[PDB]
Structure formats: C-alpha cells, structure tokens
Short mmCIF file of C-alpha atoms in Angstrom, two decimals:
data_model
loop_
_atom_site.label_atom_id
_atom_site.label_comp_id
_atom_site.label_asym_id
_atom_site.label_seq_id
_atom_site.Cartn_x
_atom_site.Cartn_y
_atom_site.Cartn_z
CA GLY X 1 228.76 36.67 298.40
CA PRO X 2 229.47 35.09 302.81
CA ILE X 3 230.77 36.70 305.10
CA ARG X 4 234.46 35.81 305.66
CA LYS X 5 236.05 34.54 308.19
CA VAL X 6 239.74 33.97 307.64
CA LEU X 7 242.78 34.27 309.79
CA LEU X 8 246.48 35.15 308.70
CA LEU X 9 249.78 35.15 311.08
CA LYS X 10 252.72 37.00 310.61
CA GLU X 11 255.88 37.79 311.75
CA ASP X 12 256.04 41.08 312.86
CA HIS X 13 259.58 42.12 310.14
CA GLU X 14 256.46 41.98 307.22
CA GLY X 15 253.84 43.45 306.69
CA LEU X 16 250.56 42.42 305.42
CA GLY X 17 250.67 42.01 301.49
CA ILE X 18 248.42 43.93 300.41
CA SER X 19 247.13 46.52 298.60
CA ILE X 20 243.62 48.25 299.28
CA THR X 21 242.37 50.90 297.76
CA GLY X 22 238.42 52.61 298.37
CA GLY X 23 237.11 54.07 302.68
CA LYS X 24 233.93 55.56 303.35
CA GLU X 25 235.00 59.53 301.17
CA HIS X 26 234.74 57.75 298.36
CA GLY X 27 232.02 55.81 299.17
CA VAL X 28 232.94 52.67 298.91
CA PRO X 29 233.82 49.46 301.92
CA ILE X 30 238.12 49.17 302.01
CA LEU X 31 239.13 46.75 298.92
CA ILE X 32 242.23 44.79 298.66
CA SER X 33 242.55 45.53 295.38
CA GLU X 34 245.96 43.89 294.83
CA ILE X 35 246.88 40.41 296.92
CA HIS X 36 251.57 40.25 296.71
CA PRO X 37 253.13 37.02 296.03
CA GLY X 38 254.99 35.23 298.45
CA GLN X 39 252.86 37.93 301.72
CA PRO X 40 250.88 37.44 304.45
CA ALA X 41 248.02 37.35 302.39
CA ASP X 42 248.98 35.49 299.90
CA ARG X 43 249.97 32.43 302.37
CA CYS X 44 246.91 33.18 304.75
CA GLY X 45 245.71 31.80 301.43
CA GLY X 46 242.04 32.75 302.18
CA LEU X 47 242.25 36.08 301.35
CA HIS X 48 241.74 37.50 297.53
CA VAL X 49 242.14 41.14 294.83
CA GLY X 50 238.35 42.22 295.06
CA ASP X 51 237.01 41.11 299.32
CA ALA X 52 235.93 44.10 300.95
CA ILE X 53 237.62 43.94 304.41
CA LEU X 54 234.80 44.61 307.10
CA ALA X 55 237.30 43.91 309.49
CA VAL X 56 240.13 43.11 311.31
CA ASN X 57 240.92 41.44 314.62
CA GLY X 58 236.90 42.83 315.35
CA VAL X 59 237.52 46.15 314.38
CA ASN X 60 235.24 47.21 312.55
CA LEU X 61 235.77 49.11 308.72
CA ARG X 62 233.41 48.97 307.03
CA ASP X 63 232.84 52.87 307.68
CA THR X 64 236.58 53.70 308.14
CA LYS X 65 237.93 56.15 305.86
CA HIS X 66 241.19 55.59 303.94
CA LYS X 67 244.11 56.16 305.79
CA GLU X 68 241.22 55.25 309.07
CA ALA X 69 241.98 52.39 307.90
CA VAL X 70 246.04 51.96 306.54
CA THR X 71 246.66 52.68 310.37
CA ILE X 72 244.67 50.15 312.26
CA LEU X 73 245.31 47.67 309.75
CA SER X 74 248.90 47.91 309.62
CA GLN X 75 248.85 48.20 313.16
CA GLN X 76 247.59 44.93 313.55
CA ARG X 77 249.99 41.46 313.81
CA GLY X 78 250.54 38.46 314.66
CA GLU X 79 247.47 35.74 314.76
CA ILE X 80 245.20 38.82 312.08
CA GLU X 81 241.27 37.90 312.02
CA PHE X 82 239.90 39.49 309.13
CA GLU X 83 236.75 40.02 308.34
CA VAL X 84 236.29 39.96 304.82
CA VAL X 85 232.97 39.59 301.68
CA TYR X 86 233.48 39.17 297.68
CA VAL X 87 231.05 41.19 295.58
CA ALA I 1 243.67 52.03 286.05
CA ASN I 2 241.36 55.30 287.37
CA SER I 3 242.75 56.12 290.47
CA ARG I 4 240.86 58.53 291.40
CA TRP I 5 240.61 56.64 294.50
CA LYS I 6 243.29 56.24 297.22
CA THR I 7 245.60 52.81 297.26
CA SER I 8 247.76 52.22 299.92
CA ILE I 9 250.53 49.49 299.74
CA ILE I 10 250.14 47.71 304.06
#
C-alpha cells in the first residue's frame, strides 16, 4: 500500500503497545503482528497489524535485525513519528 | 502459528 506517516503519543510509563516480528535475519521487514488494546499504538489510530515499520523518528528500520529494531523502537519517547506501509 | 520468526512485545 502507500507509505504513510503516523504520529503516536505516549507517556514514559507505558510501552508502544505493539508486538513486532521479522527483521533482516529473517529476510523480511519489521512487521507489526499485534496492536494491544488501549495502549498507545491502538489509541493513535494509524497503526495496524500487517504494517511494516520503515522508520521511527527518522531512524530507518528497513535493514535492521529484530533486536536492533527493539532497542531503537523502545528508546523513543513522547511524540513519535512512524513511517509505515501495509503490504 | 509457526514462530520461526522472532516476536517481541514493545
């Protein structure tokens, strides 16, 4: 689908509210496999199961290994911009 | 499901 920019707002006491799967070692993008109810990704409205995460706050995630992506994603705070695509 | 691919809750 089209590449989208999506804003997520979160406070420091919570996570993103997603499960991710995939990554470079598996030959696939970082993919959202779950959106957890009532958590920031669900609340933001624009992120969905099946979306590939291309970048977060300008940090490219397309060639990143799974754990690399976890570290990068979990470091982000506050108002967080995602670049995502559903395919 | 298969679960060959790693999954993380974040």
